[PDB]
Design a protein around this ligand. Structure first.
Ligand SMILES: Nc1nc2c(ncn2[C@@H]2O[C@H](COP(=O)(O)OP(=O)(O)O)[C@@H](O)[C@H]2O)c(=O)[nH]1
Length: 415
C-alpha cells in the first residue's frame, strides 16, 4: 500500500484543519490514551461531537491516515516555516492536494478574491504540479438554503473556469460537496445532498493515480566515468536514471551530440541484455570517440536527447553565504554527475519562504536564508532537465569554498 504525502490547502477558516482532523479521526491512528480521553470528555458533556472537538484540540496542540489504496501523511501546507525550502531540498514534497473551498456566502468570494488564498493556492498547486487536485466545497450545510446544489455548481463552474484560465488542466480535478465536522461526503455518503451522485472525498483519494515510473520516462544516463579497455573499446559507466537501455540500442551523448551503438552492458561484472532505472552499469559503445565523452555528460536515446542548457531557471534556497550574492556570482553547481561553474545571470525574484509567492521583483542581491527564482548560465555546455520531468537531473547544489551555498530545483531550461 503506497504512502502519499497530502497537503490540504485553501483560504483561512474555510475548514482545512477541520477536514484534516476529520480524516485523522475517521481513518488515522490517534493513540488510545487520547481517543479514550476524548470519548470520556464526550460522555461527561453528553455530546457525541465532543469527541471530535476534543481530538481537534489535541491535534492542534500536536498525522497519517489510511484509505482503501493508500497511506496518507498530511504534510505542511503553505504559511509555514521552511515551506518553500523543504520542497526545494526534497525534505517534504506533496504527492497530492485537497483544496478546501467554503460554500458559505461571502467566504467563497473572499477566498477567490484577488487577495484570497483559494486563488493563491490554486496557482501554487499549478506550480507544484498537483494536476490531480481534489476540491472539497465545504460548509455545504451553511448555504442558503442548506445543501444548495445551485451554490455548489456555481462554485465548481467558477473555480473550474479560473483553473483553466491559469493553465491548470482540470481533466483530473475532482470536486465534492462536503461538510467537514460530520464527515459528510468525506468518509461516508451524505444523506443531505441527494442531488450529488458522485464519489466521496475518500473515494476520490483512492482514485488518485501514482506519478509516472522512471522506467517509463525517456532514457537518461548521467556519465560517471569513461574508460577505454584494451581490446574492448570505449566504455562509459553511469547509473540509469530513467528509461531502459538495451544491447543494440543507438544512443546519443550530450552535450557532444555524438551517436553510438551499445554493444554490451554489465552490472556487477555480469553482462546483461538491458539496464533499467537504478542499475549502475558499464556499457561498451561503438562509434563515439572517448574524447566526446566525459563525466557529467548524459546519455539518452536519439529521439529524446538529454537537454543541454544555454540558460536555466531555478527555485533556490540560499543555505549558506557569509555576505551577499548578486548577479555575476559564479559558484560550481553539482547536478547529477556534473560539476560545472554556472553564472547567476538574473535574480528574478525573492519568494515568500512560507508561501512560495513572489515577495520582491528583481532583488539587487540575495542573503543567507532567502528563497528565490534565479537564472543561471553554464560556463560550458551542461546537461540539465526540469526537476518535474527528470527529478535526478533537476536538483542541484551550489558549492563554494567546500560549502553548499544553496540548493535548487530547475523550473525552466532554455536549450
Ligand atoms: N457548519 C460548519 N462549520 C464548519 C465546516 N467546516 C469548518 N467549519 C467551521 O469553520 C471554522 C473554520 O474551520 P477551520 O477548520 O478551523 O478552518 P481553517 O482556518 O481552514 O483550518 C471553525 O469554526 C469550524 O468548526 C462546515 O462544513 N460546516
Amino acid at each position: 500500500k503506497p504512502h502519499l504525502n497530502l497537503i490540504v490547502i485553501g483560504h483561512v477558516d474555510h475548514g482545512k484543519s477541520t477536514l484534516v482532523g476529520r480524516l485523522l479521526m475517521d481513518r488515522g491512528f490517534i493513540d488510545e490514551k487520547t481517543v479514550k480521553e476524548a470519548e470520556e470528555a464526550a460522555k461527561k458533556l453528553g455530546k457525541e461531537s465532543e469527541k471530535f472537538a476534543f481530538l481537534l484540540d489535541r491535534l492542534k496542540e500536536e498525522m497519517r491516515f489510511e484509505t482503501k489504496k493508500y497511506f496518507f501523511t498530511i504534510i505542511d501546507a503553505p504559511g509555514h516555516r521552511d515551506f518553500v525550502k523543504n520542497m526545494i531540498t526534497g525534505a517534504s514534497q506533496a504527492d497530492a492536494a485537497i483544496l478546501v473551498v467554503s460554500a458559505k456566502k461571502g467566504e467563497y468570494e473572499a477566498g477567490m478574491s484577488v487577495e484570497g488564498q483559494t486563488r493563491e493556492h490554486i496557482i501554487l498547486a499549478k506550480t507544484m504540479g498537483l494536476d490531480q487536485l481534489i476540491v472539497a466545497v465545504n460548509k455545504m450545510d451553511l448555504t442558503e438554503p442548506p445543501y444548495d446544489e445551485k451554490r455548489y455548481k456555481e462554485i465548481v463552474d467558477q473555480v473550474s473556469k479560473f483553473m483553466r484560465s491559469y493553465g491548470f488542466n482540470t481533466n483530473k480535478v475532482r470536486f465534492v460537496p462536503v461538510v467537514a465536522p460530520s464527515g459528510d461526503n468525506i468518509t461516508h455518503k451524505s444523506e443531505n445532498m441527494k442531488w450529488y451522485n458522485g464519489p466521496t472525498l475518500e473515494e476520490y483519494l483512492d482514485q488518485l493515480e501514482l506519478p509516472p515510473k522512471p522506467v517509463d520516462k525517456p532514457l537518461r544516463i548521467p556519465i560517471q566515468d569513461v574508460y577505454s579497455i584494451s581490446g574492448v573499446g570505449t566504455v562509459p559507466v553511469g547509473r540509469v536514471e530513467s528509461g531502459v537501455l538495451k544491447v543494440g540500442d543507438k544512443i546519443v551523448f550530450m552535450p557532444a551530440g555524438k551517436v553510438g551503438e551499445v554493444r554490451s552492458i554489465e552490472t556487477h561484472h555480469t553482462k546483461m541484455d538491458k539496464a533499467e532505472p537504478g542499475d549502475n552499469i558499464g556499457f561498451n559503445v561503438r562509434g563515439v570517440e572517448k574524447k566526446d565523452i566525459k563525466r557529467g555528460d548524459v546519455v539518452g536515446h536519439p529521439n529524446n536527447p538529454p537537454t543541454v542548457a544555454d540558460e536555466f531557471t531555478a527555485r533556490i534556497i540560499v543555505v549558506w553565504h557569509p555576505t551577499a550574492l548578486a548577479n555575476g556570482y559564479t559558484p560550481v553547481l553539482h547536478v547529477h554527475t556534473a560539476s560545472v561553474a554556472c553564472r547567476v545571470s538574473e535574480l528574478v525574484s525573492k519568494l515568500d519562504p512560507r508561501t512560495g509567492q513572489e515577495a520582491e521583483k528583481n532583488p539587487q542581491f540575495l542573503k543567507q536564508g532567502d528563497v528565490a527564482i534565479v537564472k543561471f548560465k553554464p560556463i560550458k555546455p551542461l546537461c540539465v532537465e526540469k526537476y518535474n520531468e527528470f527529478p535526478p537531473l533537476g536538483r542541484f547544489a551550489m558549492r563554494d569554498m567546500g560549502k553548499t551555498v544553496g540548493v535548487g530545483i530547475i523550473v525552466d531550461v532554455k536549450p
